[PDB]
Amino acid sequence: SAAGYDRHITIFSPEGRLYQVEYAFKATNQTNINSLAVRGKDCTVVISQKKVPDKLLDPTTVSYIFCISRTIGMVVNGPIPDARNAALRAKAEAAEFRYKYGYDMPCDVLAKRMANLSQIYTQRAYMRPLGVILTFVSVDEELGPSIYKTDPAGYYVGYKATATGPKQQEITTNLENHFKKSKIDHINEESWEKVVEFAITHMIDALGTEFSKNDLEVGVATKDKFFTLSAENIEERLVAI
Amino acid sequence: QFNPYGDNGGTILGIAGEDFAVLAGDTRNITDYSINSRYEPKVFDCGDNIVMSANGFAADGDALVKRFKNSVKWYHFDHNDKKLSINSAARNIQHLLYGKRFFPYYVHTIIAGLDEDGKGAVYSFDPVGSYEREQCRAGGAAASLIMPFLDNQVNFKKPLKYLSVEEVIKLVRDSFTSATERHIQVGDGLEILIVTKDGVRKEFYELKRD
Amino acid sequence: TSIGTGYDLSNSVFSPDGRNFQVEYAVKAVENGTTSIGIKCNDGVVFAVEKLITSKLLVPQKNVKIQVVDRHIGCVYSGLIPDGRHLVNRGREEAASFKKLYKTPIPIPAFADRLGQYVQAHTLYNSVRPFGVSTIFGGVDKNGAHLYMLEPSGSYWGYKGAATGKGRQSAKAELEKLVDHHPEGLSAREAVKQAAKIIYLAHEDEKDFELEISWCSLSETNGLHKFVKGDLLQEAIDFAQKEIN
Amino acid sequence: MQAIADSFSVLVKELQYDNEQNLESDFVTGASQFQRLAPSLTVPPIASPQQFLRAHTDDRNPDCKIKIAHGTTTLAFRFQGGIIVAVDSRATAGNWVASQTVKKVIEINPFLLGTMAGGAADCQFWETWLGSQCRLHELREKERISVAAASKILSNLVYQYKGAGLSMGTMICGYTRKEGPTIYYVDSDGTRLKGDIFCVGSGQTFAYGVLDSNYKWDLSVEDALYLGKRSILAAASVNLYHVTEDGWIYHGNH
Amino acid sequence: MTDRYSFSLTTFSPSGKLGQIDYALTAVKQGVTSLGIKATNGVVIATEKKSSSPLAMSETLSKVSLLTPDIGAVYSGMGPDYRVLVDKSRKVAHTSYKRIYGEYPPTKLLVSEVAKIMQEATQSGGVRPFGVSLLIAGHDEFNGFSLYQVDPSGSYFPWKATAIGKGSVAAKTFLEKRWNDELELEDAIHIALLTLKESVEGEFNGDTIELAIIGDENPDLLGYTGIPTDKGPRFRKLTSQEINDRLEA
Amino acid sequence: MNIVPQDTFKSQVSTDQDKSVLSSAVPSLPDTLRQQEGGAVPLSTQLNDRHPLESTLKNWETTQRQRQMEQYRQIFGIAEPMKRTMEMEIVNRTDFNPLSTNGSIHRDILLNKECSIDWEDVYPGTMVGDDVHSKIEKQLGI
Amino acid sequence: GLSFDNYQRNNFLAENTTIVGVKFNNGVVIAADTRSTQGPIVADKNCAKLHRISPKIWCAGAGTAADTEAVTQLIGSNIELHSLYTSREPRVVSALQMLKQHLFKYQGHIGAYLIVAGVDPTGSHLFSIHAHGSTDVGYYLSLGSGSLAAMAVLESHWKQDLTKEEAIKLASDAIQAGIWNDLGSGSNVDVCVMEIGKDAEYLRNYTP
Amino acid sequence: MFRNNYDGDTVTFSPTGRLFQVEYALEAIKQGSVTVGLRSNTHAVLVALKRNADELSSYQKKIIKCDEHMGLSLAGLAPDARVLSNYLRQQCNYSSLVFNRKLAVERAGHLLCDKAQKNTQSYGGRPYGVGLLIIGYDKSGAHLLEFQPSGNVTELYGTAIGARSQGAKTYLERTLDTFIKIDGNPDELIKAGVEAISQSLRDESLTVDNLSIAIVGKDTPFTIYDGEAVAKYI
Amino acid sequence: TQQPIVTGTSVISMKYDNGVIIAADNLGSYGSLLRFNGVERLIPVGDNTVVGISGDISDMQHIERLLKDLVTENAYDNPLADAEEALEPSYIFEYLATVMYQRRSKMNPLWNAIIVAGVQSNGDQFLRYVNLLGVTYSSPTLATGFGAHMANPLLRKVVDRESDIPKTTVQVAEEAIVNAMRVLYYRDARSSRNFSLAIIDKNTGLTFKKNLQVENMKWDFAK
Incomplete structure (x- = not known):
């Protein structure tokens, strides 16, 4: 661990590392849930795991998927307070971009903006990074289906598909094997329902033990709108193969 | 351009006696041809046996009397x-x-x-x-x-x-x-x-025009 | 380990495991407060507080332990009294501003989000301290009845039933039993009786205590937040005393 | 951070009482308005305050007009052991009766005197302020202030407001051990002139001529007083002041 | 007040060394290898792409950035600091030079601006030094081609050929044995590929390494025609197909 | 919710209104020598004959920022403007570079002006003062 | 930024072209005359008035010449920085927004009146921009002291289905009418053609 | 020992969840002398025992007048007492000037709570360390409030604060029904207060020098008796 | 503002033995165009106070917002807001007069004339006037604009001094107010036939009558 300083603020250790950033990274696995993001031909699908062990909770109020703009959706890995803080700031960023430049904010530009803010947090002494990982999904009017991920260190990158959580390695390996088999960097289907079913199947075979309709959360981005599915829609998708 | 002033048309008189003082004023408030009110006092007791009157633009006089009374309170x-x-x-x-x-x-x-x-x-x-x-x-x-x-x-x-x-x-x-x-x-x-x-x-006396 | 040495002297510091120990210490401060519960019925909410008796010198009507944030929003809290008062004032300001701007009472989830963001902003800098209070609030809006619980970390959730304070374990067990025994739902009067019973059962610590209950229901109070009159409170107390003995 | 929260938490704005200056001026928070060594002056919050003030200061009620100091003759000179200051006390009547006689010369200190010759309020206010400044300086330095320093303070102050609307011409007369007897003239334009003989008034050429006819450095006190009284009488009863190292002495009609 | 200041985060150790700058240099030395080679007709700048997972699209994130049409840069160290400094350099090229003189700055002056920005971070009360090292290649009318290296402390030096990162010493020796005053741009590209071949542990193909050149003007990249005096950009980033073709040859 | 800046005129004046440059001999009067403004510039002259657009240009960005904060307060709550102001204040207070006047990179990122240029950027711009110690005294409040 | 020094001093001392834009089925054309006048005197008989905000976004201005040049250059710098930041081709709407907000900020004290044409991944765009910060869309626009003759020519022979050649001819004819019938215009005709999916073609001294 | 590590400032919780600087500020009240407040349906009174530095010194002022209808008494630090009394005076003055309205006692208590809570959650300052007893008469009748510097205000019929105030509080509890009904007789209420404060005396006797009294009521403006004016109540 | 655009004409008010009566017409005029019909210019603030405003309509709506904010802030957080801690007419008038004078001193006045009418908690009648200059005064009869020259001489016939107040019933005062409104509709070119009236009585409370029309108009003497 940090010897002297580096236990409070973000300055270099003798090894050239930033311990507070790494600890913020470790803070992202507190919720112990997983999320997956895949691209279709004209849609992008994000599927997140719901865990509600408490019987006194209202399940409809538990969600880690947020709507940022008309076309952009976001999934957060980490504690829900920093998740909501990040969601509000992302909404403000997208709206201000639209006001200032006359056209809708693309997913990758928003990811870069959030990453620059994270860089601010990693360099300033009196600011702490947010212990969350952000994944933005959309169907950009130029780049087509898009998935971009940002982390507490300020690093962001785009993905053909991605997975994040305590069990991200298994899902990543399964996706890599599937893409080796199919030799296509996306899913060849004409409707987002088939893509959602494929993502559910991938999640089931990776995590194991399956789930019901109340243990899952699905968001789908098309060229016009990003929308979150309800419990009945997820039940229909589970029933339909 | 906006003109911030006005005129309300009063008359005041102060007289110093041997062991007393007197401050009197007419009680009519007008706007240049019309009678706004027939009874509107302009001579005020300010405390510590001091009487004050500010005749002219009524808003300015009210503001000055208000400020003086607050200052006396803090004093x-x-x-x-x-x-x-x-x-x-x-x-x-x-x-x-x-x-x-x-x-x-x-x-x-x-x-x-x-x-x-x-x-x-x-x-x-x-x-x-x-x-x-x-x-x-x-x-x-x-x-x-x-x-x-x-x-x-x-x-x-x-x-x-x-x-x-x-x-x-x-x-x-x-x-x-x-x-x-x-x-x-x-x-x-x-x-x-x-x-x-x-x-x-305090003393009051009716004048003409009621 | 509950005590993180070297990472528990500043507010906005991550531990090597990714934990914030000052927020957890505020949580421990919350866990020593007085027991408070909230129950959500078919068309409203009920709040119950285990008040501790005090000297007779207190004016009886000027010391109430259930705060009215707005005509449709009522809340209780456990922890530090000044922090609870501050958060209630912030909630009242937010509700008033929303009603002024949009000419309608603020929906409960929007109020919960604003309060949660305000609480979360106090875990970001070393010049402030996390709030040492946990709050159970709720009410009725156009979408129905809502009950929420908010924690010092800024985390909040909607609940079927919520409990906080020293007697939180027994109260939570009783709330779970009540939820299990009524899959269909619950009514406001049954909710009041069960709230009195749960407050009475949770008490375990030579000191005499009184009870406060509060309603907010569409059928009973026309969607407004009200206290309990003599008759209903006495009936609930009788039911609770029968339950205990 | 909590102050920031208070700034964004929702009557006071319309009253303009969120500004500390407005609260101080109305004596809400205390009597700090009466505690400023440098007084604060209200200015119209418009693009042309000077034009506004000039237009509104020349328009009906005689009692609501700004009082102007008498343009009557004022004389000052320094003969051998002090300063003779002479004015004419022929006051002008109006709709009032005076309890006692007025004075055309302001007594700044037991050692300093000034003359109005301009706007009455400006001279009275700023010479009282100058007396306060001189008192504070003398307390600090444990010595009487030089006349040059006091005149320079007044000149700097009036120059800071040059062109705003002030009008005042004053003669600062003093006597110190290091300087001797000194007379300065300070104007609202920032002028500051040291001199031996000053004559400012309606008719001052006659008084200046009478002085120049019979002026010498070897005048005695009685001779100097008589010469000043005669000069004032020639100009146009007469209030006299004799300033020496120990202060000023007032003569009613000597 | 005690918040009207904040003590310096970078101080001298008793031996006379600034510890934070040394730790930033260590962080640079833990990074991926990048190199630059200066020839008679151009400059080659190269680096190794890395990926957290194979599912990442390596083309979205580029370690090679155009600062001006005639100036490009590459890195070793921490990526977000790179992004911040590149945005700042692109802005400064316009605010300080092009809005004043109507032309883009020479290579050395832009390097100086970047180095000043980096130095100001080592004398501060609330930012740590940038933990990154810079390679800037460029061309200008009165100085020809140039290659510079910028350190976290803000010191910059011109090089005939150099490398930074994890495999910097071996790459430096290999470039020392393989440089001369009469080298050409194609020879420099081949030498750069050979040097990078010794540092990449995984797949050495066109989708895992990144190259760019400062060479001759490319009028086909201007986007408009009609002005004979308007020179095209001299900065050009080689595609993956071109890198694969050069590797096969 | 202001677009054009409003309430830009002074309402009061005094000879000690500039706390930075006050005479030590007469604390109620300003120090003309250390002002270094030509020596013949009374404060009254600054109250008249200004260009009408100068106040609009000088306060434009602050006005837009305040409108944005007001919109955030109306739509998001108190916490959002509070956090934005806290971030900006921390960044501004931790920066002290007496030898340069340029804004920081992080300030530009927070202001969302990473790739924006205005005439203030292009045009950023004695016997006494203009030294490091004067800036130290002004920054520390001593 | 821009200074207000010596404003009072200057007050004290005092007290003592044809431009057209046309739209065709696959792009836009912008044309201008080449006469520069410092009053009644012809300063330059061949002066370029078509200015480049970006390689495929061009503009031509009237009013205060220094203001027009400075505003165009500043918006070009902003557009270049934004395009680098987003790694995307600049759009005409972005330049329009930047110009509109910059002109609205100065409350009409910057005397630049512009015609802005361009192509981008969303298509072809033509806009008119006023010095006070108002903008408008059109299929054909004219500007300058010769704008009425040019607009008469445009109203004579404009239709929805126009090829590149017909659009170039029509713009050239409008500039020619401005040249012949207006004293401020004359000399040559400069053209710039932008098509969807091609490089911009800048033809200096097209007809003469 | 473990408390010694977590009591540096007011932005630190101990691992058990305790804010020790606020507790110390609360403990600072015991260093001040005893004050008693009580009221009936018509009048409210305060009684204070004053202390002197020595024989040659004067006695400390314990009762401060805020407005013609409201006043308070202090127990604890002098600077915070001065600050809070001046703040209450400013608030009453603002109410009177802006609305021609008398500031309510409940409003004053809420304002004091709001001002006191701020210093207990932000770094750079300290919590207040004074308890206050506030008496007033307004449109709702007579009011007595107890302000604790943690940021708490309670409304009571009677109370006492300061060193050894438990005896006076016990006496007030025992005889609540007696003095709660003393309407229209100020002298009886004042004597009840004096008898209540007599329970807190230890080797001390009330004199004309160390006793201060204050009263407010329906027709009685807030009035302070010192010196011979209290000789009749001894 | 610096010049009114949409305006209302006149408000007239009188004291009687047990309360006050106030009235104003429903019209917002756009220059000489009678643009808006249906503008309520009497604002009830609580159950004991009515405020009548004439002049600029946007400034009037701003004043209405201020009054609503004042009412809402009264209940924050007194549980006795409906009890003895309710707002008094004198409080409202003091606040409004302070605002008007402060904005006059700011060279940004609210171009309005305001009458506050109501009953104090002790049963006394309150009737006060303040304008854009901050000039305030009281009288048994009050009016703004054209009413001040036409309606006031009529009403002063009924209540000429303070001793006439106890002799004046509510019926007589209402009849006088209605007749004055009819005269105003006769001789004011910016007037409306539709008006609203409000009675504040220390016994019966507040009675707010809307959609009142001038009736019994003599037009038959044409020739």
Whole structure:
């Protein structure tokens, strides 16, 4: 661990590392849930795991998927307070971009903006990074289906598909094997329902033990709108193969 | 361009006696041809046996009286409820008026009370703070009608020193009655505040036009 | 480990495991407060507080332990009294501003989000301290009845039943039993009786206590937040005393 | 951070009482308005305050007009052991009776005198302020202030407001051990002139000629007083002041 | 008040060394290898792409950035600091030079601006030094081609050929044995590919390494025609197909 | 919710209104020598004959920022403007570079002006003062 | 930024072209005259008035010449920085927004009146921009002291289906009418053609 | 020992969840002398025992007048007492000036709580360390409030604060029904207060020098008796 | 503002033995165009106070917002807001007059004339006037604009001094107000036939009558 300083603020250790950033990274696995993001031909699908062990909770109020703009959706890995803080700031960023430049904010530009803010947090002494990982999904009017991920260190990158959580390695390996088999960097289907079913199947075979309709959360981005599915829609998708 | 000033047309008079002071004013508030109100006092008891009047633009006079009363409240708070003397009040009012040197109050101010020897005292202020102690001061419309009437019956040089309070009240009433007869802005009532060692007493007399 | 040495002297510091120990210490401060519960019925909410008796010198009507944030929003809290008062004032300001701007009472989730963001902003800098209070609030809006619980970390959730304070374990067990025994739902009067019973059962610590209950229901109070009159409170107390003995 | 929260938490704005200056001027928070060594002057919050003030200062009620100091003759000179200051006390009557005689010369200190010759309020206010400044300086330095320093303070102050609307011409007369007897003239334009003989008034050429006819450095006190009185009488009863190292002495009609 | 200041985060150790700058240099030395080679007709700048997972699209994130049409840069160290400094350099090229003189700055002056920005971070009360090292290649009319290296402390030096990162010493020796005054741009590209071949542990193909050149003007990249005096950009980033073709040859 | 800046005129004046440059001999009067403005510039001259657009240009960005904060307060709550102001204040307070006047990179990122240029950026711009110690005294409040 | 020094001093001392834009089925054309006048005197008989905000976004201005040049250059710098930041081709709407907000900030004290044409991944765009910050869309626009003759020519022979050649001819004819019938215009005709999916073609001294 | 590590400032919780600086500020009240407050349906009174530095010194002022209808008494630090009394005076003055309205006692208590809570959650300052007893008469009748510097205000019929105030509080509890009904007789209420404060005396006797009294009521403006004015109540 | 655009004409008010009566017409005029019909210019503030405003309509709506904010802030957080801690007419008038004078001193006045009418908690009648200059006064009869020259001489016939107040019933005062409104509709070119009236009585409370029309108009003397 940090010897002297580096236990409070973000300055270099003798090894050239930033311990507070790494600890913020470790803070992202507190919720112990997983999320997956895949691209279709004209849609992008994000599927997140719901865990509600408490019987006194209202399940409809538990969600880690947020709507940022008309076309952009976001999934957060980490504690829900920093998740909501990040969601509000992302909404403000997208709206201000639209006001200032006359056209809708693309997913990758928003990811870069959030990453620059994270860089601010990693360099300033009196600011702490947010212990969350952000994944933005959309169907950009130029780049087509898009998935971009940002982390507490300020690093962001785009993905053909991605997975994040305590069990991200298994899902990543399964996706890599599937893409080796199919030799296509996306899913060849004409409707987002088939893509959602494929993502559910991938999640089931990776995590194991399956789930019901109340243990899952699905968001789908098309060229016009990003929308979150309800419990009945997820039940229909589970029933339909 | 917006004009922030106005005129309300009153008449005030302050007289210093041997052991008393008198401040009187007409109670009619008008807007240049119309009667806004027939009873609107302009002479106010400010505490510590000090009476004040600010004749002219009514909003400015109300603001000045409000500020002076609040300042007197803080003076009592900060100095163990010490009585504010008339000369100290005059200096406070001078500072209050000169604080608006480049945006002045459009008023003529008169204050009355008793000095540290118990004798009557009246102070008159110019609109930007210049002030002096006087035996008798008439201000506003019809002052040119009121001062000669007083000088015709009083030797300020019966001498004013030996006059009683009732005689002064009667003389003020007579001068205001004559001014009401001769001037279209004077009338509808006269209010007189008298300051003596026993405090402040109020008198009201109806004038013409009801 | 409950005590993180070297990482528990500043507010906005991550531990090597990714934990914030000052927020957890505020949580421990919350866990010592008085027991408070909230129950959500078919068309409203009920709040119950285990008040501790005090000297007779207190004016009886000027010391109430259930705060009215707005005509449709009521809340209780456990922890530090000044922090609870501050958060209630912030909630009242937010509700008033929303009603002024949008000419309608603020929906409960929007109020919860604003309060949660305000609480979360106090875990970001070393010049402030996390709130030492946990709050159970709720009410009725156009979408129905809502009950929420908010924690010092800024985390909040909607609940079927919520409990906080010293007697939180027994109260939570009773709330779970009540939820299990009524899959269909619950009514406001049954909710009041069960709230009295749960407050009475949770008490375990030589000191006499009184009870406060509060309603907010569409059928009973026309969607407004009200206290309990003599008759209903006495009936609930009788039911609770029968339950205990 | 909590102050920031208070700034964004929702009557006071319309009253303009969120500004500390407005609260101080109305005596809400205390009597700090009467505690400023440098007084605060209200200015109209418009593009042309000077034009506004000039237009509104020349328009009906005689009692609401700014009082102007008498343009009557004022004389000052320094003969051998002090300063003779002479004014004419022929006051002008109006709609008032004076309890006692007025004075055309302001007594700044027991050792300093000034003359009005301009706007009465400006001269009275700023010479009282100058007396306060001189008192504070003398307390600090444990020595009487030089006349040059006091005149320079007044000149700097009036120059800071040059063109705003002030009008004042004053003659600062003093006597110190290091300087001797000194007379300065300070104007609202920022002028500051040291001199031996000053004559400012309606008719001052006659008084200046009478002085120059019979002026010498070897005048005595009685001779100097007589010469000043005669010069004032030639100009146009007469108030006299004799300033020496120990202060000023006032003569009613000597 | 005690918040009107904040003590310096970078201080001298008793030996006379600034510890934070040394730790930033260590962080640089833990980074991926990048190199630059200066020839007679151009400059080659190269680096190794890295990926957290194979599912990442390596083309979205580029370690090679155009600062001006005639100036490009590459890195070793921490990526977000790179992004911040590149945005700042692109802005400064316009605010300080092009809006004043109507032309883009020379290579050395832009390097100086970047180095000043980096130095100001080592004398501060609330930012740590940038933990990154810079390679800037460029061309200008009165100086020809140039290659510079910028350190976290803000010191910059011109190089005929150099490398930074994890495999910097071996790459430096290999470039020392393989440089001369009469090298050409194609020879420099081949030498750069050979040098990078010794540092990449995984797949050495066109989708895992990144190259760019400062060479001759490319009028086909201007986007408009009609002005004979308007020179095209001299900065050009080689595509993956071109890198694969050069590797096969 | 202001677009054009409003309430830009002074309402009061005094000879000690500039706390940075006050005479030590007469603390109620300003120090003309250390002002270094030509020596013949009374404060009154600054109250008249200004270009009408100068106040609009000088306060433009602050006005837009305040409108944005007001919109955030109306739509998001108190916490959002509070956090934005806290971030900006921390960044501004931790920066002290007496030898340079340029804004920081992080300030530009927070202001969302990473790739924006205005005439203030292009045009950023004695016997006494203009030294490091004057800036130290002004920054520390001593 | 821009200074206000010596404003009072200057007051004290005092007290003592044809431009057209046309739209065709696959792009836009912008044309201008080449006469520069410092009053009644012809300063330059061949002066370029078509200015480049970006390689495929061009503009031509009237009003205060220094203001037009400075505003165009500043918006070009902003557009270049934004395009680098987003790694995307600049759009005409972005330049329009930047110009509109910059002109609205200065409350009409910057005397630049512009015609802005361009192509981008969303298509072809033509806009008019006023010095006070108002903008408008059109299919054909004219500007300058010769704008009425040019607009008469445009109203004579404009239709929805126009090829590149017809659009170039029509713009050239409008500039020619401005040249012949207006004293401020004359000399040569400069053209710039932008098509969807091609490089911009800048033809200096097209007809003469 | 473990408390010694977590009591540096007011932005630190101990591992058990305790804010020790606020507790110390609360403990600072015991260093001040005893004050008693009580009221009935018509009048409210305060009684204070004053202390002197020595024989040659004067006695400390324990009762401060805020407005013609409201006042308070202090127990604890002098600077915080001065600050809070001036703040209450400013608030009353603002109410009177802006609305021509008398500031309510409940409003004053809420304002004091709001001002006191701020210093207990932000770094750079300290919590207040004075308890206050506030009496007033307004449109809702007579009011007595107890302000604790943690940021708490309670409304009571009677109370006492300061060193050894438990005896006076016990006496007030025992005889609540007696003095709660003393309407229209100020002297009886004042004597009840004096008897209540007599329970807190230890080797001390009330004199004309160390006793201060204050009263407010329906027709009685807030009035302070000192010196011989209290000789009749001894 | 610096010049009114949409305006209302006149408000007239009178004291009687047990309360006050106030009235104003429903019209917002756009220059000489009678543009808006249906503008309520009497604002009830609580159950004991009515405020009548004439002049600029946007400034009037701003004043309405201020009054609503004042009412809402009264209940924050007094539980006795409906009890003895309710707002008094004098409080409202003091606040409004302070605002008007402060904005006059700011060279940004609210171009309005305001009458506050109501009953104090002790049963006294309150009737006060303040304008854009901050000039305030009281009288048994009050009016703004054209009413101040036409309606006031009529009403002063009924209540000429303070001793006439106890002799004046509510019926007589309402009849006088209605007749004055009819005269105003006769001789004011910016007037409306539709008006609203409000009675504040210390016994019966607040009665707010809307959609009142001038009736019994003599037009038959044409020739």
